[PDB]
Design a protein around this ligand. Structure first.
Ligand code: GNP
Ligand code: MN
Length: 599
């Protein structure tokens, strides 16, 4: 009962304008043997049809519309939320081009394994062909993709997370290049066999072929394993493209900050997971006259404009945020974005009146159904009501502080790039780099206590090629740029603690005071101390007006202690050794220069 592609339902009515796409779709369908093939158009009628089917399958339940319009709750197989870094691969032709931060396999060996897994994997299922565009549809070189998937959950989430469907398919023209992204949950069905709400496999691979810009995923239906724009395209494949094409694909929020003189500044900031991207991206300044708007909280693609400045675009179309921790007091703008509805929640808890809840959210609900479908009771049940890494998936357009520039293909000119992580000691609240090459060193040696883990530019899990070559790429882009037009680089730490365990700096909205110093430095309106690690403000250089904080604590937050930094050196040295043969001389130079300044 194997079917030739031309007899599989849906392929006789397939779009024919792009023969490369059609031939690829035919080849994949011949291999995976779906019951039918559907090309998705991204329309609202399609979205509701797919949602109805997800409700029927039990994958979704419809939330109370009086509290969230057009919103759904999905509960996954508990086995499909586990970390799968070890199953994530960069399959470059040579191992060195994957490098020490990546998992490599010979691409021939990998294709042999995965093509075997894919054979017949879609039996009993619909195969969706999902065209999408990463970034605004009006770009010079629009980065397009097509994800083939057997998961309706994936289609609905891709509609929110990318510009999906008709417009992207048309942008491909008759022979445009696109990233081929193949996905299966790896759970074939027999005719008449009852499905489960969340199909998946015990066998998982998330594989990237940098040379051909291809992504092959098998066995997980969850998050960045299955929504292939989110990390696989946005960072892994795109970093390889950016390497070859002279631009940057980075793990950065994009923030627009407006000063009391009504001038806008744009910042890109790279922090590792759980280090404050979402809170900073949706900053509410605490000092009069300062306003903030968001362009993104996860991925930034930066390209030089004709004027010589670096311009950032957010290639995504939605927010895919961690729900626990998000609440009305820490981040009301996130909550307001979610409140507007059109949201899919995954693995959060269900209230008695059809609302959702997660740890950290206001409300103290007395009874919930938890993320496994079991009864949960306030101050009694010893298990989390929502999965600790549960998610909301919501349109960016619903964010009340969305910058008007958010859908501009040209993007926004970046004045400053920020790097930061969680450091209990050593690293000051804010430091400005000495120059671009020093800034590259600061990003390259970014540490976070998540033992201090080095997470260079917050890209440790996401580089599409050798980490050393990636540092060289950063060095190259600055070397060939107009120095006066490059973003200035800053190093922040919201997380320094005193001996009694408390945070020296209050953070959150008060980070606007740090950003004010950064703006002033960009405008040459602020001073600071010249220290061995860069320029660091004194307490008197910061606007602490109206801030109920002990000045000694702010002083401590800003201290540069030579002894602490001397203990930091061998940790940095161990890391630069780990980077391996491709460590750029320019990065080693900065290490040497830091060691010299410290004495
Ligand atoms: N002490 C302190 N904690 C902060 C600050 N900003 C954010 N956090 C805390 O950091 C944790 C995660 O913050 P979040 O903004 O979600 O970081 P994130 O980088 O977006 N996580 P992810 O990127 O994986 O979605 C939250 O518990 C939040 O309370 C800050 O300025 N100071
Ligand atoms: Mn976040």
């Amino acid at each position: 009962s194997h079917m030739t592609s031309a007899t599989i339902p849906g392929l006789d009515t397939a779009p024919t304008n792009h023969q490369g796409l059609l031939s690829w779709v035919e080849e994949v369908a011949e291999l995976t043997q779906p019951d039918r093939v559907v090309f998705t158009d991204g329309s609202e009628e399609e979205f509701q049809r797919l949602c109805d089917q997800l409700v029927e399958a039990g994958t979704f339940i419809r939330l109370n519309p009086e509290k969230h319009k057009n919103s759904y709750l999905a509960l996954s197989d508990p086995s499909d939320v586990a970390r799968v870094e070890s199953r994530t691969y960069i399959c470059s032709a040579k191992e060195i081009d994957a490098g020490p931060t990546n998992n490599w396999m010979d691409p021939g060996e990998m294709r042999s394994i995965m093509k075997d897994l894919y054979r017949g994997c879609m039996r009993g299922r619909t195969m969706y062909v999902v065209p999408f565009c990463m970034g605004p549809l009006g770009a010079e070189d629009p980065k397009l993709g097509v994800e083939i998937t057997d998961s309706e959950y994936v289609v609905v989430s891709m509609r929110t997370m990318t510009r999906m469907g008709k417009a992207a398919l048309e942008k491909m023209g008759d022979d445009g290049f696109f990233v081929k992204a193949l996905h299966s949950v790896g759970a074939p069905l027999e005719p008449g066999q009852k499905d489960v709400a969340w199909p998946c496999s015990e066998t998982k691979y998330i594989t990237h072929f940098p040379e051909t810009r291809e992504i092959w995923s098998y066995g997980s239906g969850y998050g960045g394993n299955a929504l292939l724009g989110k990390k696989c395209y946005s960072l892994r494949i795109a970093s390889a493209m950016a390497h070859d094409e002279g631009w940057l694909a980075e793990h950065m929020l994009i923030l627009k900050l407006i000063s009391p003189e009504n001038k806008a500044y744009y910042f890109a900031a790279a922090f590792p997971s759980a280090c404050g991207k979402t809170n900073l991206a949706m900053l509410q300044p605490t000092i009069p006259g300062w306003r903030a708007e968001t362009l993104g909280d996860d991925i930034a693609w930066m390209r030089f404009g004709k004027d010589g400045r670096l311009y950032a675009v957010n290639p995504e179309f939605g927010f895919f945020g961690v729900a626990p921790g998000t609440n009305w007091k820490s981040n009301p703008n996130a909550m307001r974005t979610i409140a507007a509805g059109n949201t899919v929640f995954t693995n959060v808890a269900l209230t008695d009146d059809g609302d959702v809840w997660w740890e950290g959210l206001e409300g103290d609900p007395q009874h919930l159904i938890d993320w496994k479908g079991n009864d949960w009771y306030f101050r009694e049940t010893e298990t989390n009501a929502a999965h600790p890494n549960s998610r909301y998936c919501t349109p960016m357009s619903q964010c009340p502080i969305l910058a008007p520039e958010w859908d501009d293909p040209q993007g926004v000119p970046i004045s400053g790039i920020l790097f930061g992580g969680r450091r209990k000691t050593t690293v000051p609240l804010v430091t400005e780099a000495r120059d671009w090459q020093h800034g590259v060193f600061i990003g390259a040696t970014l540490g976070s206590e998540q033992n201090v883990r080095r997470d260079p530019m917050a890209m440790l899990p996401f580089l599409g090629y050798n980490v050393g070559d990636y540092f060289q790429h950063w060095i190259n882009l600055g070397k060939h740029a107009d120095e006066s037009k490059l973003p200035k680089v800053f190093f922040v730490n919201w997380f320094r603690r005193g001996d009694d365990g408390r945070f020296l700096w209050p953070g959150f909205g008060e980070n606007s005071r740090v950003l004010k110093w950064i703006v002033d430095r960009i405008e040459h309106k602020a001073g600071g101390a010249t220290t061995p690690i860069g320029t660091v403000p004194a307490v008197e250089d910061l606007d602490l007006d109206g801030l109920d904080v002990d000045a000694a604590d702010v002083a401590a937050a800003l201290a540069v202690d030579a002894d602490e930094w001397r203990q930091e050196l061998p940790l940095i040295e161990e890391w630069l050794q780990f980077v391996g043969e491709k460590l750029p001389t320019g990065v080693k130079d900065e290490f040497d220069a830091l060691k010299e300044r410290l004495g």
